[PDB]
């Protein structure tokens, strides 16, 4: 009814401990959601073309040209770690667990309130907020995944990360097809490179509408909507990282001389001359068995062309890579291609009491050592005469195409049948949790954005919208915009996300890395004297494991 | 890198059997799950297909 509540607030995280070292993690999330009525009730096909920016030679990487359908609907997206876990729960998970399973997800909308705004004619402005007990809220759940999948984590537009802070949903839009050509250039290129928006292919037009594809429920102040529990079919996510590169696989060489004293100046020695050694190499025309040349079971990681931009029908885009740079852990200033960089706002971690549009940002330097250090690679001739001469080696310091700032490693690819690599780690709090699997016939081995990828399906997207609230003057044949009563809705959203995790076991003599509170980071986890909050990023794969 | 340190000891991880002259140790049978290995070679390159 009007005065009877329809749900309960719940933002607890439960850890139910099962048998055999498995724990059942239930993450409850409750938010207050604020929804204004849409700017227009119509679907728009809007094109963006930043010709002014890309007209400058050398700015081709700044292309923003695209076509999208702007919809009158809003998307309630809870696909982010911060939506479900506070830093304490994350500390518990990433310190005490070894792997994580995504089990189930359900959500509901309850305690719907629809209000209208009226403004007086008094010379000093003044407005009064009133209830409309008979207005309705339009709620659509796309359980069959008919609409384009638009995870809001990519744009930092999920629900907020604080239970005590009200949140807003993101206006929903999806991509419309377009053909675009952009010929690259550089500062000093003469003429105008071809920079043209070609329009849309009729063969690819897909105009989706919520009304035609999803059942829509009209919720009044006494109604509630529950989605039901959806169960995932995803692979487990490891909460441990690998440290072993190819150089640390297998049996080390036997040391025939060992140090007799402590100190860094006292090393051990193999003793056997390098060409006289025993072992197996994949170099059939050399007798040198060294740590670099000895054969290994397979390859860990792969070189990829970095900051490579590929063009297709829709224009240029960056070639994605599955691993971060080498040596970035020692020096963050060297973090580059492959290290995901997150920009977010006051709803998602930025200090809630800052001023200005500048976002908060961090680059995630994962603990897994699966990357490459291209400044240390080289190619040399098959003859393999050592020391190698100038003409017989291609160093990263050598130019390609006459460019003094491009070397062979920029265009280099060593992905092969022998490559082994890990899934992306969970990035807390701004990282996406699950992703939908591509509908290609041949599918990618992993997604760079979410650690969980949905094989068959995963939960339908939840769309909300304030039902039209018309005045007495509505005329459907009038060309101008609709005349509506200024209406907005506040409703309560509750979600339940269920995980299954395995408690870790101490395998080594030494203690592993753990997350802790310390004097430097202490104030990152408590409110300021004027109510300000922030959620800094936490690494997930703290503990090591043996690759081989 | 401290996050990668892994010091293993046999005494802390494996049961250890002390054997005297009159003792013996059998491991039991382990059964594999590997794929078959072919004792034949292929000769066709792309130029000899079809």
Coordinates of C-alpha atoms in Angstrom, one line a residue:
Chain A
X1 CA 0.0 0.0 0.0
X2 CA 0.9 3.7 0.2
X3 CA 2.2 3.6 3.8
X4 CA 3.6 0.0 3.9
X5 CA 7.2 -0.7 3.1
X6 CA 8.1 -3.3 0.5
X7 CA 11.7 -4.2 1.3
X8 CA 14.5 -3.9 3.8
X9 CA 17.9 -2.3 3.7
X10 CA 20.9 -4.6 3.8
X11 CA 24.6 -3.9 3.1
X12 CA 26.1 -6.8 5.1
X13 CA 28.7 -9.2 3.9
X14 CA 28.5 -12.7 5.3
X15 CA 31.2 -15.4 5.4
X16 CA 29.6 -18.8 5.9
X17 CA 32.4 -21.4 6.3
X18 CA 31.6 -24.7 4.6
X19 CA 33.4 -28.1 4.7
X20 CA 36.8 -28.7 3.2
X21 CA 38.2 -25.2 3.3
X22 CA 35.5 -23.5 1.3
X23 CA 33.7 -20.3 2.3
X24 CA 30.3 -19.0 1.1
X25 CA 30.6 -15.2 0.7
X26 CA 27.3 -13.4 0.4
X27 CA 27.6 -9.7 -0.4
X28 CA 24.5 -7.6 0.2
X29 CA 24.3 -4.1 -1.3
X30 CA 21.6 -1.5 -0.7
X31 CA 21.5 2.0 -2.3
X32 CA 19.1 4.9 -2.5
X33 CA 18.7 5.7 -6.2
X34 CA 17.7 9.1 -7.6
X35 CA 16.1 9.2 -11.0
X36 CA 15.1 12.4 -12.9
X37 CA 12.8 12.2 -15.8
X38 CA 14.5 12.0 -19.2
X39 CA 15.5 15.1 -21.2
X40 CA 13.2 13.8 -24.0
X41 CA 11.0 10.8 -24.3
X42 CA 12.3 10.1 -27.8
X43 CA 15.1 7.9 -29.2
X44 CA 17.8 10.0 -30.8
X45 CA 20.5 9.0 -33.4
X46 CA 23.3 11.3 -32.6
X47 CA 26.7 11.5 -34.3
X48 CA 29.9 12.8 -32.8
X49 CA 32.7 14.0 -35.0
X50 CA 35.6 15.9 -33.4
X51 CA 37.1 17.1 -36.7
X52 CA 38.5 20.1 -35.0
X53 CA 40.7 17.9 -32.7
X54 CA 41.7 15.3 -35.3
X55 CA 42.2 18.0 -38.1
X56 CA 45.5 18.7 -36.3
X57 CA 48.1 16.4 -37.8
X58 CA 49.3 13.9 -35.3
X59 CA 46.1 13.8 -33.2
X60 CA 44.6 10.7 -34.8
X61 CA 44.8 8.9 -31.5
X62 CA 42.3 11.4 -30.1
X63 CA 39.4 10.4 -32.4
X64 CA 36.0 10.5 -30.8
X65 CA 33.9 10.0 -33.9
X66 CA 31.0 7.6 -33.3
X67 CA 27.3 7.2 -33.7
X68 CA 25.0 6.3 -30.8
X69 CA 21.3 5.9 -30.0
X70 CA 20.5 8.1 -27.0
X71 CA 17.6 6.5 -25.2
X72 CA 15.1 7.9 -22.6
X73 CA 16.0 5.0 -20.2
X74 CA 18.5 4.7 -17.4
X75 CA 20.7 1.8 -16.5
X76 CA 21.1 0.4 -13.0
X77 CA 24.6 -1.2 -13.2
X78 CA 26.1 -2.8 -10.1
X79 CA 29.0 -4.5 -11.9
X80 CA 31.9 -3.1 -9.8
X81 CA 33.8 -4.4 -6.8
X82 CA 33.2 -1.3 -4.7
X83 CA 29.5 -1.8 -5.0
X84 CA 29.8 -5.0 -2.9
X85 CA 32.9 -4.8 -0.7
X86 CA 34.3 -2.3 1.7
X87 CA 38.1 -2.3 2.2
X88 CA 37.9 -4.6 5.3
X89 CA 36.0 -7.3 3.4
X90 CA 38.5 -7.0 0.5
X91 CA 41.4 -7.4 3.0
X92 CA 39.8 -10.5 4.4
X93 CA 39.2 -12.0 0.9
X94 CA 42.6 -11.2 -0.6
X95 CA 44.6 -12.1 2.6
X96 CA 42.9 -15.3 3.5
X97 CA 41.5 -16.7 0.2
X98 CA 43.3 -18.4 -2.7
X99 CA 40.6 -18.5 -5.4
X100 CA 37.2 -17.0 -6.0
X101 CA 34.1 -18.4 -7.7
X102 CA 31.2 -16.3 -9.0
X103 CA 28.0 -18.1 -8.0
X104 CA 24.8 -16.1 -8.2
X105 CA 23.3 -12.6 -8.4
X106 CA 19.9 -11.1 -7.6
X107 CA 18.6 -7.6 -7.2
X108 CA 15.3 -5.9 -6.4
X109 CA 13.7 -2.4 -6.3
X110 CA 11.6 -1.4 -3.4
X111 CA 10.1 1.6 -1.6
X112 CA 9.4 3.6 -4.7
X113 CA 8.7 7.3 -4.2
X114 CA 7.6 9.6 -7.1
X115 CA 7.5 13.4 -6.5
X116 CA 6.6 16.4 -8.6
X117 CA 8.2 19.9 -8.5
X118 CA 6.1 23.0 -8.6
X119 CA 7.6 26.5 -8.8
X120 CA 5.7 29.6 -7.7
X121 CA 5.3 32.8 -9.7
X122 CA 6.7 34.8 -6.8
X123 CA 9.4 37.2 -7.9
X124 CA 12.0 35.6 -5.6
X125 CA 12.0 32.0 -6.8
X126 CA 10.5 29.3 -4.5
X127 CA 9.5 25.8 -5.3
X128 CA 7.6 23.1 -3.4
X129 CA 8.0 19.3 -3.7
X130 CA 4.9 17.2 -3.6
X131 CA 4.1 13.5 -3.8
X132 CA 2.2 11.9 -6.7
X133 CA 0.9 8.7 -5.2
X134 CA -0.5 7.5 -8.6
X135 CA 2.6 8.1 -10.7
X136 CA 4.5 5.0 -11.9
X137 CA 8.1 4.0 -12.4
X138 CA 8.9 2.0 -15.5
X139 CA 11.2 -0.9 -14.7
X140 CA 12.4 -3.3 -17.5
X141 CA 14.7 -6.3 -17.0
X142 CA 16.3 -7.7 -20.2
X143 CA 16.6 -11.2 -19.0
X144 CA 17.1 -12.6 -22.5
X145 CA 20.0 -10.2 -23.3
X146 CA 18.3 -8.7 -26.3
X147 CA 19.8 -5.3 -25.8
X148 CA 23.5 -4.4 -26.4
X149 CA 25.7 -5.1 -23.4
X150 CA 26.9 -1.8 -21.9
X151 CA 28.9 -2.4 -18.7
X152 CA 29.0 0.9 -16.9
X153 CA 32.3 0.2 -15.2
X154 CA 34.1 1.2 -18.5
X155 CA 32.8 4.8 -18.1
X156 CA 33.0 4.8 -14.3
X157 CA 29.2 5.0 -14.3
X158 CA 28.1 2.1 -12.0
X159 CA 26.3 2.7 -8.7
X160 CA 28.2 4.4 -5.9
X161 CA 30.4 2.7 -3.4
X162 CA 28.9 4.1 -0.2
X163 CA 25.8 2.7 1.4
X164 CA 25.1 6.0 3.2
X165 CA 25.4 8.1 0.0
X166 CA 22.5 8.2 -2.5
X167 CA 23.3 7.3 -6.0
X168 CA 22.0 7.8 -9.6
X169 CA 21.7 5.5 -12.6
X170 CA 23.4 6.3 -15.9
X171 CA 21.4 7.4 -18.9
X172 CA 21.4 4.5 -21.3
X173 CA 22.9 4.7 -24.8
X174 CA 24.3 2.2 -27.3
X175 CA 26.4 2.3 -30.4
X176 CA 24.9 2.9 -33.9
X177 CA 26.8 1.7 -36.9
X178 CA 29.0 4.2 -38.8
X179 CA 31.8 4.1 -41.3
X180 CA 34.8 6.3 -40.6
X181 CA 38.2 6.7 -42.3
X182 CA 41.2 8.5 -40.7
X183 CA 44.6 8.5 -42.3
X184 CA 47.3 9.1 -39.7
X185 CA 49.9 11.9 -39.9
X186 CA 52.5 13.6 -37.9
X187 CA 53.5 17.2 -37.0
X188 CA 55.1 18.1 -40.3
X189 CA 52.8 16.2 -42.6
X190 CA 51.9 18.4 -45.6
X191 CA 48.3 18.6 -46.7
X192 CA 45.1 17.3 -45.1
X193 CA 45.0 13.5 -44.4
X194 CA 41.7 11.9 -45.3
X195 CA 39.5 12.6 -42.3
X196 CA 36.0 11.8 -43.4
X197 CA 32.8 10.4 -41.7
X198 CA 31.3 8.1 -44.3
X199 CA 27.8 7.5 -42.8
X200 CA 26.0 4.3 -42.0
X201 CA 25.8 0.9 -43.7
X202 CA 22.1 -0.1 -44.1
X203 CA 23.3 -3.8 -43.9
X204 CA 24.3 -3.2 -40.2
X205 CA 21.5 -0.9 -38.9
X206 CA 20.2 -2.2 -35.5
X207 CA 17.8 0.1 -33.7
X208 CA 16.8 -1.4 -30.4
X209 CA 14.0 -0.2 -28.2
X210 CA 13.2 -1.3 -24.7
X211 CA 9.4 -1.1 -25.2
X212 CA 9.5 -3.5 -28.1
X213 CA 12.0 -6.0 -26.6
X214 CA 11.5 -6.2 -22.8
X215 CA 8.4 -6.5 -20.6
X216 CA 8.1 -3.2 -18.6
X217 CA 6.6 -3.2 -15.1
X218 CA 4.9 -0.1 -13.8
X219 CA 5.7 0.4 -10.1
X220 CA 3.7 2.7 -7.9
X221 CA 4.7 3.8 -4.4
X222 CA 3.4 0.5 -3.0
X223 CA 5.0 -1.9 -5.5
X224 CA 8.3 -3.8 -5.6
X225 CA 10.2 -5.6 -8.3
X226 CA 12.6 -8.5 -7.8
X227 CA 14.7 -10.1 -10.6
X228 CA 15.1 -13.6 -9.3
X229 CA 18.4 -15.3 -8.7
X230 CA 20.7 -15.7 -11.7
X231 CA 23.4 -18.4 -11.5
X232 CA 26.8 -17.9 -13.2
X233 CA 28.8 -20.4 -15.2
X234 CA 32.2 -18.7 -14.9
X235 CA 35.7 -20.1 -14.4
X236 CA 37.4 -19.6 -11.0
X237 CA 39.5 -16.5 -10.4
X238 CA 42.9 -16.9 -8.7
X239 CA 43.8 -14.7 -5.8
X240 CA 47.5 -15.5 -6.2
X241 CA 50.1 -14.3 -8.6
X242 CA 53.0 -16.0 -10.5
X243 CA 56.6 -14.8 -10.2
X244 CA 58.3 -17.3 -12.5
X245 CA 59.5 -16.1 -15.9
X246 CA 61.0 -18.5 -18.3
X247 CA 64.4 -18.1 -16.6
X248 CA 63.0 -19.7 -13.4
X249 CA 61.4 -22.9 -14.8
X250 CA 62.8 -26.3 -14.1
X251 CA 66.0 -27.5 -12.4
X252 CA 68.7 -24.9 -11.9
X253 CA 72.3 -25.6 -12.9
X254 CA 74.4 -27.5 -10.3
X255 CA 76.8 -25.2 -8.6
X256 CA 80.3 -26.8 -8.2
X257 CA 81.5 -23.8 -6.2
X258 CA 79.5 -22.4 -3.3
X259 CA 80.2 -19.3 -1.2
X260 CA 82.2 -19.7 2.0
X261 CA 81.2 -16.4 3.5
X262 CA 78.1 -14.2 3.7
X263 CA 77.8 -11.0 1.6
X264 CA 76.6 -9.8 -1.8
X265 CA 80.2 -10.0 -3.1
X266 CA 80.2 -13.8 -2.5
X267 CA 78.5 -15.5 -5.4
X268 CA 78.2 -19.2 -6.3
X269 CA 79.7 -20.6 -9.5
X270 CA 78.6 -23.4 -11.9
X271 CA 82.2 -24.3 -12.6
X272 CA 81.6 -26.1 -15.9
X273 CA 82.7 -24.2 -19.0
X274 CA 79.8 -22.9 -20.9
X275 CA 80.3 -25.0 -24.1
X276 CA 81.2 -28.1 -22.1
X277 CA 78.0 -28.2 -20.2
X278 CA 75.2 -30.8 -20.3
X279 CA 71.5 -30.0 -21.0
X280 CA 69.1 -29.5 -23.8
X281 CA 68.8 -26.4 -26.0
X282 CA 66.6 -25.5 -29.0
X283 CA 69.7 -24.1 -30.7
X284 CA 70.8 -27.0 -32.9
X285 CA 74.0 -25.2 -34.1
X286 CA 75.6 -24.1 -30.9
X287 CA 77.3 -25.8 -27.9
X288 CA 76.6 -23.0 -25.4
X289 CA 74.1 -24.1 -22.7
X290 CA 73.4 -21.0 -20.7
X291 CA 70.4 -19.8 -18.7
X292 CA 69.3 -17.8 -21.7
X293 CA 69.7 -20.6 -24.2
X294 CA 68.6 -23.7 -22.3
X295 CA 65.3 -25.0 -23.3
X296 CA 62.2 -24.4 -21.2
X297 CA 58.8 -26.2 -21.1
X298 CA 57.0 -23.3 -22.8
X299 CA 56.8 -19.5 -22.9
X300 CA 55.3 -17.3 -20.2
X301 CA 53.8 -14.2 -21.6
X302 CA 54.2 -12.7 -25.0
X303 CA 55.6 -9.6 -26.7
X304 CA 52.9 -7.5 -28.4
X305 CA 53.1 -4.4 -30.5
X306 CA 52.6 -1.6 -27.9
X307 CA 50.7 1.6 -28.6
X308 CA 49.7 0.0 -31.9
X309 CA 46.6 1.5 -33.4
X310 CA 44.5 -0.6 -35.8
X311 CA 41.9 0.8 -38.1
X312 CA 38.6 -0.9 -39.2
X313 CA 35.3 0.3 -40.5
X314 CA 34.7 2.5 -37.5
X315 CA 38.2 4.0 -37.3
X316 CA 41.4 3.5 -35.3
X317 CA 41.6 1.8 -31.9
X318 CA 44.4 0.6 -29.7
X319 CA 45.5 -3.0 -29.9
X320 CA 44.8 -4.5 -26.5
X321 CA 47.4 -6.5 -24.5
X322 CA 46.9 -9.0 -21.7
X323 CA 49.9 -8.2 -19.5
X324 CA 51.7 -5.2 -17.9
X325 CA 55.2 -3.8 -18.4
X326 CA 58.3 -5.3 -16.9
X327 CA 60.1 -3.3 -14.3
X328 CA 57.1 -1.2 -13.5
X329 CA 56.9 -2.6 -10.0
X330 CA 60.3 -1.2 -9.1
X331 CA 59.5 2.2 -10.7
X332 CA 55.8 3.2 -11.3
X333 CA 57.0 6.0 -13.7
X334 CA 57.7 3.2 -16.2
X335 CA 54.1 1.9 -16.1
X336 CA 52.8 1.8 -19.7
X337 CA 50.8 -0.2 -22.2
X338 CA 49.0 -3.1 -20.5
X339 CA 48.7 -1.5 -17.0
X340 CA 45.1 -0.5 -16.8
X341 CA 44.5 3.1 -15.8
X342 CA 41.3 4.1 -14.0
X343 CA 39.7 7.5 -13.9
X344 CA 36.8 8.0 -11.6
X345 CA 34.8 10.5 -9.5
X346 CA 33.4 11.2 -6.1
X347 CA 30.9 8.4 -6.3
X348 CA 33.6 5.8 -7.0
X349 CA 36.6 6.7 -4.8
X350 CA 37.7 10.2 -5.3
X351 CA 37.7 12.3 -2.1
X352 CA 34.1 13.2 -1.8
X353 CA 34.9 16.7 -0.7
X354 CA 37.1 17.9 -3.5
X355 CA 36.2 20.7 -6.0
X356 CA 36.6 20.6 -9.8
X357 CA 36.0 18.4 -12.7
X358 CA 39.5 16.8 -12.6
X359 CA 39.1 13.1 -11.9
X360 CA 41.0 10.9 -9.6
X361 CA 43.3 8.4 -11.4
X362 CA 45.5 5.4 -10.7
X363 CA 47.4 3.0 -12.9
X364 CA 47.2 -0.6 -11.7
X365 CA 50.5 -2.4 -11.4
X366 CA 49.6 -6.0 -10.9
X367 CA 51.9 -8.4 -9.0
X368 CA 52.0 -11.0 -11.7
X369 CA 55.4 -11.1 -13.5
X370 CA 54.1 -12.1 -17.0
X371 CA 55.2 -9.1 -18.9
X372 CA 58.2 -8.0 -21.0
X373 CA 61.0 -5.5 -20.8
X374 CA 61.5 -4.5 -24.5
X375 CA 64.6 -2.5 -23.7
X376 CA 66.3 -5.8 -23.0
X377 CA 65.2 -7.9 -26.1
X378 CA 67.3 -8.4 -29.2
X379 CA 67.4 -10.5 -32.4
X380 CA 70.6 -11.9 -33.8
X381 CA 71.6 -14.0 -36.8
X382 CA 71.1 -17.7 -37.0
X383 CA 74.8 -18.2 -37.2
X384 CA 75.2 -17.2 -33.5
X385 CA 78.8 -16.2 -33.5
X386 CA 79.6 -14.6 -30.2
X387 CA 80.3 -11.8 -29.3
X388 CA 77.7 -10.7 -31.9
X389 CA 78.7 -8.0 -34.3
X390 CA 76.8 -4.9 -35.3
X391 CA 75.4 -6.1 -38.6
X392 CA 74.2 -9.4 -37.0
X393 CA 72.0 -8.1 -34.2
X394 CA 68.8 -6.0 -34.2
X395 CA 68.8 -4.1 -30.9
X396 CA 65.9 -2.1 -29.4
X397 CA 68.1 1.0 -29.9
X398 CA 68.0 0.5 -33.7
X399 CA 65.6 2.4 -35.9
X400 CA 62.8 0.9 -38.0
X401 CA 61.7 2.7 -41.1
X402 CA 64.1 5.5 -40.4
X403 CA 62.4 6.5 -37.2
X404 CA 64.7 7.2 -34.3
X405 CA 61.9 6.6 -31.9
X406 CA 60.5 3.3 -33.2
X407 CA 62.4 0.1 -32.8
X408 CA 61.6 -3.5 -33.8
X409 CA 60.0 -4.2 -30.4
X410 CA 57.2 -1.7 -31.3
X411 CA 56.1 -4.0 -34.2
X412 CA 57.0 -7.2 -32.4
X413 CA 54.7 -10.2 -31.7
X414 CA 55.8 -13.5 -30.1
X415 CA 52.4 -15.0 -29.4
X416 CA 52.5 -18.7 -30.3
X417 CA 51.3 -22.2 -29.4
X418 CA 53.8 -22.2 -26.5
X419 CA 52.4 -19.1 -24.8
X420 CA 51.1 -19.3 -21.2
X421 CA 49.5 -16.3 -19.5
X422 CA 47.1 -15.5 -16.6
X423 CA 43.7 -13.9 -16.5
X424 CA 43.5 -10.2 -15.4
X425 CA 43.4 -9.7 -11.7
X426 CA 40.4 -8.1 -9.9
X427 CA 41.0 -4.4 -9.6
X428 CA 39.3 -3.0 -6.5
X429 CA 37.1 -1.0 -6.3
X430 CA 36.7 0.4 -9.8
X431 CA 37.2 -2.9 -11.6
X432 CA 34.4 -4.7 -13.4
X433 CA 33.4 -8.1 -11.9
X434 CA 31.9 -10.0 -14.8
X435 CA 31.7 -9.6 -18.6
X436 CA 29.5 -11.1 -21.3
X437 CA 31.2 -13.4 -23.8
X438 CA 31.6 -12.2 -27.4
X439 CA 29.1 -13.8 -29.9
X440 CA 31.9 -14.6 -32.4
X441 CA 32.3 -18.1 -33.6
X442 CA 35.8 -18.0 -32.3
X443 CA 36.2 -16.5 -28.9
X444 CA 39.0 -14.7 -27.0
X445 CA 41.0 -16.6 -24.5
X446 CA 40.3 -13.8 -21.9
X447 CA 38.8 -10.4 -21.4
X448 CA 41.1 -7.5 -20.3
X449 CA 38.3 -5.8 -18.2
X450 CA 36.6 -8.4 -16.0
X451 CA 38.1 -11.5 -14.3
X452 CA 34.8 -13.4 -14.8
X453 CA 33.5 -14.0 -18.3
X454 CA 30.0 -15.4 -18.9
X455 CA 30.0 -18.4 -21.2
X456 CA 26.3 -18.8 -21.9
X457 CA 24.6 -15.7 -20.4
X458 CA 24.7 -13.5 -17.4
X459 CA 22.2 -11.3 -15.7
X460 CA 20.0 -9.1 -17.8
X461 CA 20.5 -5.4 -17.6
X462 CA 18.0 -3.5 -15.4
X463 CA 16.5 -0.4 -17.0
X464 CA 14.4 2.2 -15.2
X465 CA 12.5 5.3 -16.3
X466 CA 9.9 7.8 -14.9
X467 CA 6.6 7.2 -16.7
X468 CA 5.4 10.2 -18.7
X469 CA 3.4 12.6 -16.5
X470 CA 1.4 14.8 -18.9
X471 CA -0.4 18.1 -18.4
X472 CA -3.9 18.8 -19.7
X473 CA -2.5 20.4 -22.9
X474 CA -0.8 17.4 -24.5
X475 CA -1.3 17.2 -28.2
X476 CA 0.3 14.2 -29.9
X477 CA 0.3 15.9 -33.3
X478 CA 2.3 18.9 -32.1
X479 CA 5.8 18.9 -33.5
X480 CA 7.3 20.6 -30.4
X481 CA 8.5 18.6 -27.4
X482 CA 6.1 17.0 -24.9
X483 CA 4.6 19.1 -22.1
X484 CA 5.3 17.1 -18.9
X485 CA 5.0 17.7 -15.2
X486 CA 8.5 17.9 -13.7
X487 CA 8.7 14.4 -12.0
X488 CA 11.5 12.5 -10.4
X489 CA 11.7 9.2 -8.5
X490 CA 13.7 8.0 -5.5
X491 CA 13.6 4.2 -5.0
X492 CA 15.7 1.7 -3.0
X493 CA 17.8 -0.9 -4.7
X494 CA 19.0 -4.1 -3.0
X495 CA 21.4 -6.6 -4.6
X496 CA 22.8 -9.9 -3.5
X497 CA 26.1 -11.2 -4.9
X498 CA 27.2 -14.7 -3.9
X499 CA 30.8 -15.9 -4.1
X500 CA 32.5 -19.1 -3.2
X501 CA 36.2 -18.9 -2.1
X502 CA 38.9 -21.3 -1.0
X503 CA 40.9 -20.6 2.2
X504 CA 44.6 -20.4 1.4
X505 CA 47.3 -22.8 2.8
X506 CA 50.8 -21.9 4.0
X507 CA 53.1 -23.9 1.7
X508 CA 56.4 -22.1 2.3
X509 CA 58.6 -21.5 5.4
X510 CA 58.5 -17.7 4.9
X511 CA 55.4 -15.4 5.3
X512 CA 53.6 -14.2 2.2
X513 CA 52.7 -10.6 1.3
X514 CA 49.6 -9.3 3.0
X515 CA 47.5 -6.1 3.0
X516 CA 47.6 -4.2 6.2
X517 CA 46.7 -0.8 7.7
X518 CA 49.7 1.4 8.4
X519 CA 50.5 5.0 9.4
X520 CA 50.8 6.2 5.9
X521 CA 47.6 4.7 4.5
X522 CA 45.6 5.0 7.8
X523 CA 43.6 8.0 6.8
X524 CA 42.6 6.6 3.4
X525 CA 40.1 4.4 5.3
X526 CA 38.3 6.8 7.7
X527 CA 36.1 9.8 7.2
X528 CA 37.5 13.3 7.5
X529 CA 36.3 15.9 10.1
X530 CA 33.9 17.3 7.5
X531 CA 32.5 14.0 6.2
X532 CA 34.8 13.4 3.3
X533 CA 35.5 9.8 2.1
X534 CA 37.7 8.1 -0.4
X535 CA 38.3 4.5 -1.5
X536 CA 41.8 3.9 -2.7
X537 CA 42.7 0.9 -4.9
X538 CA 43.7 -2.4 -3.5
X539 CA 45.7 -5.2 -5.1
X540 CA 44.1 -8.6 -5.1
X541 CA 46.7 -11.3 -6.1
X542 CA 49.0 -10.7 -3.1
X543 CA 50.1 -14.3 -2.4
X544 CA 52.4 -16.1 -4.7
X545 CA 52.0 -19.5 -6.3
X546 CA 54.4 -21.8 -8.2
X547 CA 53.8 -21.7 -12.0
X548 CA 55.9 -24.9 -12.6
Chain B
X1 CA 61.0 -9.0 -4.8
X2 CA 59.5 -9.8 -1.3
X3 CA 56.1 -10.6 -2.8
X4 CA 57.6 -13.5 -4.7
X5 CA 59.8 -15.1 -2.0
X6 CA 59.0 -18.8 -1.8
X7 CA 61.3 -20.8 0.5
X8 CA 60.4 -24.5 0.4
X9 CA 61.6 -27.2 2.8
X10 CA 61.0 -30.9 2.4
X11 CA 60.7 -31.4 6.2
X12 CA 57.8 -28.9 6.4
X13 CA 55.9 -30.2 3.4
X14 CA 56.3 -34.0 2.9
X15 CA 56.1 -37.0 5.2
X16 CA 59.6 -38.4 5.7
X17 CA 60.2 -42.2 6.1
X18 CA 63.3 -43.3 7.9
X19 CA 64.6 -46.5 6.3
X20 CA 67.0 -48.9 8.0
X21 CA 68.7 -51.8 6.3
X22 CA 65.6 -54.0 6.7
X23 CA 63.1 -51.5 5.5
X24 CA 61.6 -50.6 2.1
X25 CA 59.5 -47.9 0.5
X26 CA 56.9 -48.3 -2.2
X27 CA 55.2 -45.2 -3.7
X28 CA 52.1 -46.9 -5.1
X29 CA 50.8 -46.6 -8.6
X30 CA 50.0 -43.3 -10.2
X31 CA 47.7 -43.2 -13.2
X32 CA 48.2 -40.5 -15.8
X33 CA 45.6 -38.5 -17.8
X34 CA 47.8 -37.4 -20.8
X35 CA 46.9 -37.4 -24.4
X36 CA 48.2 -40.0 -26.9
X37 CA 51.5 -39.5 -28.6
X38 CA 51.8 -40.3 -32.3
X39 CA 54.6 -42.5 -33.6
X40 CA 54.0 -41.2 -37.1
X41 CA 55.1 -38.0 -38.9
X42 CA 53.2 -35.8 -41.3
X43 CA 54.8 -34.7 -44.6
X44 CA 52.2 -32.5 -46.2
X45 CA 52.8 -28.8 -46.3
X46 CA 50.3 -26.3 -47.7
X47 CA 51.5 -27.1 -51.2
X48 CA 50.3 -30.7 -50.9
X49 CA 46.8 -30.2 -49.5
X50 CA 43.7 -31.0 -51.5

